[PDB]
Each structure stands twice: as structure tokens, then as C-alpha cells.
Design a protein around this ligand. Sequence first.
Ligand code: NA
Length: 401
Amino acid sequence: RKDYAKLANYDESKVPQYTLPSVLMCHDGEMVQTKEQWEQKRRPEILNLFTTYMFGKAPVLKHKLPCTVSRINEKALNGRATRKEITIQLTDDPQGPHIDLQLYLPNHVSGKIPVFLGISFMPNYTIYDDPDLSVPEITDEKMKKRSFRGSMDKSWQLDKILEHGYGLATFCYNDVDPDFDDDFQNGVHPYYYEKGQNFPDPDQWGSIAAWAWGMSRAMDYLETDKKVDAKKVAVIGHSRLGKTAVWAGASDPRFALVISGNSGCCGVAISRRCFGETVEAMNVRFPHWFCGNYKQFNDREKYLPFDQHELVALIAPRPIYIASAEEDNWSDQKGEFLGGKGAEPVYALYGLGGIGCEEMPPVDTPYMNGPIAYHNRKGPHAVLPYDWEQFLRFADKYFKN
Ligand code: NA
């Protein structure tokens, strides 16, 4: 019902007073001052609070899901790449939902290959204009195409990625759970209900948590593929899928590097600023996104047990790239910058520096010599070739020698 877009505040001066919850102080009040105390005592407290109160618990599995490598082309893209389709069975029902993962690896590169794991709004054929993914429309019985081959090429830059000697793997988020407020009708959630349960408990996963769990299932296959380097898998997504990729990085330490693509409100942006999008605008307009518990903080940011700098802190010591867009005031770009700045004291526990500047930098001015990178670039809320340029130059610092 309510608007929210026109009620929002975009005026830095009308931003309220606030105090950031202290990331280094435990629940019992003892301050952390060593990485040991962070890993042993404080980090699990913060992981617990984000799992309990905003993203929701996700199933732990006795064993890996079944998958099959259902298609391979070692001469894909005129011999430039090997293309693999991997279907991952998400539930115990083989006619239930599956992740249809699409992996591209460069040919002519010897070792195990670093890979960017991404999650997309649309099906796999939009990632690249791949001409041998082609059967005519008049004979096609498969799902009717809503976009076109390679429509999202500007958001994925496969050519840039292969050129750095890296791979790209992606799946569409609707494989795991449709982005509709439908009580998870056609998603994975009901397959993991107990017999006396007909919707997730208030502390159990919503959609973002399920989509993140999906990336983790894709990593379960990737780490068994002899050509990919299981030590150098990055995660990336944009907007709601940026919120997802940050959570997947936070709750799955296997991932080597995290890319926040305009993750904004309830991503890396500090909620207490109440700038642009707000917790309540979020939960009211997308109630399936977060767990039941999170709705208690509608218009009540003062009472969050945490704020989003502590989410970023879950990444440390691993690197994270925070990307803002100049026109995307809805994401609160300064707030996104401050989400990274608030995490600096944890990274210092590992003897690492910070972003590299004290106040928010001007547009088109990246900082990436520290463990947390930041840019706010010209133009619109999206992931553009400009963003991939910075992403890949940051990744080279960690994956190349
Ligand atoms: Na905000």
C-alpha cells in the first residue's frame, strides 16, 4: 500500500543521530582485541545474530546433493572455452527444483583456474551471446524465452573474465525459490519442513538465505571439479542478489573474495542512517526476503542487535569489493561506504589496513589497495563493464602473483 519511494529521505543533513553497535564488544561486555578472541568468541556471536534475526537458518546436510554434468563442450566459443552444464538436485524429489549451473573455463590455461560464482536474475542464456545455445523457436518445446541470448552481457563480461585467465559460473536465482511473496510455494523451503510445520519458523531461512544456500551448493560441485581452483572462488551478485552474495560470503568461509554489487539497504549500507530504502520499506514490499524475526525492526532501526558493518566484518580477513552507483541514491552510497569503514577495526586485528581514505571519495575514484575496496561510479544502479574492470583488477591482487 504505502509509497516509500516518495517518503524516503535523500538529504544528508536530515540523517538522524545514531550510535553504531560495537563490533568488538561481546554480549557479556568483554572487548575483543586479538584475532584469536574474534574467531573464538565474538565472530560466532555476530554470525548467530545475523542468522537468527535477519537471514534465517538454512538446512545442514548429511551429504552432498546429487548432481550430474549433463552437457559439455570442450570447444565452446570457437575453441576459446570449455562450457559445462551441471544440474544439481536441491531436494529429495528428482522432479523437484534443480539448480541448472552453467560453467565457462578458458581453454589454453594450464593450472587449476580461479572462478567467479555469480547468481543472476534471468536464465543462463542471457549471460552471453553463445551461438551454439541455439535451437529455432518454431520447433522449441522448452520454456519460452522472455529475453534474448546475451542480453545481460554488459553485466557479466565473460570476455573480460576469460581474458584474465579466470572462469565464470552462474545460475538463475528462481531455480532455488521464485522471487514472489507466495509462501515459498514453488521453492525449496517446503521440502525441508518437518511433518508438523507448514511455513518456516521465525528464525528459519527466507529467500535471500535460500539463494545464498544455493551458491554454497554450487561450491559443493565446483570444489570437486579438477580444473577449478577451490581456493580462489569469488561470489558476486547485484542489488537483492548483492545482498545474497555478501551473505553467502559471510556464512561460507570457503569463498575467497566477495563482490557487493549495489547491495544497498540490508546489504552493506548502514541501516541506522534511514537514508533512501529502509528496513520497513524492505520487509513490507518483499516479506519473503528475510526471516520472520527481521520484521520486528520495521521503523525500529534503533533496536537492531547489530548493523551492517558487522555483516562486512564477517568477511574478514578475506577481501570484499563494495560498489556504489552515483545515481542509485536508494541504496545510500555513503551508507554503503560506511558499512565498509565500520568493519576496519576487525581487519586491523589481522594487521591489514583499511579502505584507504577517511571520507567518501568522489565519483569514478576507486580505492582498492586494502582488504576492503570501494568505488562510487557515474551512472545507474546496475553492474556495468566499468564495475567488472575494477573487480578484475582487485581480484588479480589476490589470485595472480
Ligand atoms: Na537505507
